[PDB]
């Protein structure tokens, strides 16, 4: 990295105001229908959101005991933004190491803990449940059949992207990116704090982003300097943040932090979701870093809209029968 992160954290220049500060009770389906979930949102308190979180003093070791000591986790090397892998016990050892003894800065942003004990300790905002394509569009008998708690693709029965635990040490930095498939993101600061820089997905900015990706100079060019308006904003302990489809963001961690969050597609900004998918295609993003079963899901969305509106099914007889059995439960 050749830019100075500390000047990016200190400057007053990222002074756009893109974020809407909301109350949880107002974050409902009617709000989504009216606004298209186009605006990033901050909930300074959880009242009215319908979230559930672990004990306030939950630790990384607690996460490890819920997911398993031997669970392989993807870890980011902050200096290179490259991925490595280790077990959750090894990750916990790292995390518990005093700061002045850690040889390198590593970050975990990708531990998906669905189908472990941890899963029932964390609930996302109720309203996300009413609109996530996984919950509302994917054949339910397939989702319910998932047993594997890792993100091994051969065992994956639906897009396993709903619930992640992020564990970040002071000094961590995740460089600018758009979440896979143009997914929207919810993000809850259980403990600690985060700094985000937000860049809106205008056609121009998305062109810049793609060209930056294709240049390979991500360590040299701080993308928030290349655009007309960027917002840097701090999330404090207990805040919930929702990031809309397409939004280009980077994140810095000023104190050891534990976050619960996750990703979702939805029906109100499909064009952006498709745009982002096509950027991933052109920039040759490896499958492993993409939304699993993306076009499969899109076919299921079409079928659900036609069925729900017209009562005509385009699922197989067997699939219809599986669905009817569940309707009778």
């Amino acid at each position: 990295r050749t830019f100075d992160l500390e000047e990016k954290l200190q400057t007053n220049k990222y002074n756009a105001n893109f974020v809407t500060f909301m109350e949880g009770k107002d974050f409902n389906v009617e709000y989504i229908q009216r606004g298209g979930l186009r605006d990033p949102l901050i909930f300074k308190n959880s009242d009215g959101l319908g979230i559930k979180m672990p004990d306030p003093d939950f630790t990384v070791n607690d996460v490890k005991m819920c997911v398993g000591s031997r669970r392989m986790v993807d870890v980011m090397d902050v200096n290179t933004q490259k991925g490595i892998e280790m077990t959750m016990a090894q990750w916990t050892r790292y995390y518990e190491t005093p700061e002045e003894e850690r040889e390198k800065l590593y970050n975990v942003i990708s531990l998906e803990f669905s189908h472990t004990r941890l899963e029932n300790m964390v609930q996302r905002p109720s309203t996300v449940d009413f609109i996530d394509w996984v919950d509302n569009m994917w054949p339910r008998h397939l989702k319910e059949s998932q047993t594997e708690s890792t993100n091994a693709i051969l065992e994956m029965q639906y897009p396993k992207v709903q619930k992640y635990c992020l564990m970040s040490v002071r000094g961590c930095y995740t460089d600018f990116h758009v979440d896979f498939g143009g997914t929207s993101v919810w993000y809850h600061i259980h403990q600690g704090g985060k700094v985000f820089w937000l860049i809106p997905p205008t056609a121009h900015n998305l062109e810049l982003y793609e060209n930056w990706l294709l240049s390979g100079k991500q360590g040299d060019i701080f993308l928030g300097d290349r655009v007309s308006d960027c917002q840097r904003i701090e999330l404090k302990q207990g805040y919930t943040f929702v990031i809309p489809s397409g939004w280009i963001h980077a994140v810095y961690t000023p104190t050891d932090t534990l976050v619960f969050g996750g990703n979702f597609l939805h029906s109100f900004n499909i064009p952006m979701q498709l745009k982002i998918y096509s950027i991933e295609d052109r920039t040759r993003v490896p499958n492993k870093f993409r939304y699993p079963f993306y076009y499969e899901m899109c076919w299921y969305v079409l079928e659900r809209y036609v069925y729900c509106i017209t009562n005509r099914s385009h699922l197989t007889k067997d699939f219809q029968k599986e669905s009817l059995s569940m309707d009778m439960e």
């Binding site: 993807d74 933004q81 942003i109 998906e112 890792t150 460089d175 870093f289 993409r290």
Partner: peptide, 13 residues
């Protein structure tokens, strides 16, 4: 060595 999907990570430098 099983292949994974839905790994969150920006691009490498």
């Amino acid at each position: 060595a099983p292949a994974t999907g839905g790994v969150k990570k920006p691009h490498r430098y």
